[PDB]
Ligand binder design. Structure first.
Ligand SMILES: [Zn+2]
Length: 126
């Protein structure tokens, strides 16, 4: 039933993208990626796809290894925190510590996405 599994992950991912579309449009879509510092032509259509993916499977939250915050970029995620008066933690993982990420007002409502189908899907990493 490996085939059935694949079709279930694909369908959950797509239903998710539709939902966010309702909460975020071409304009709101672009707003989210821009706060993330990204403006791409292969964007907004990519904004729905890659975003839904980041929410469910893995957008970066605090590390608290370093009592820090994970700030990442595509294909290099760096966590910086303060843990000691002379010691901090920096973690270099392509994918950041996966938790529910930062999403604008509208997108913020996304909390059901992950729980539904949160498999380790692909993020904005080319
Ligand atoms: Zn850290």
């Amino acid at each position: 039933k490996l085939e059935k599994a694949l079709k279930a992950q694909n369908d959950l991912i797509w239903n998710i993208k539709d939902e966010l579309k309702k909460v975020c449009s071409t304009n709101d879509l672009k707003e989210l990626l821009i706060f993330n510092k990204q403006q791409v032509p292969s964007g907004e259509s990519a904004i729905l796809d890659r975003v839904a993916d980041g929410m469910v499977f893995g957008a970066l939250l605090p590390c608290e290894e370093c009592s820090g915050q994970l700030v990442f970029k595509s294909d290099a995620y760096y966590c910086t925190g303060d843990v000691t008066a002379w010691t901090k933690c920096m973690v270099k993982t392509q994918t950041p510590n996966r938790k529910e990420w930062v999403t604008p007002k509208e997108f913020r409502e996304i909390s059901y996405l992950k729980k539904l189908k949160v498999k380790k899907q692909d993020r904005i990493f080319p």
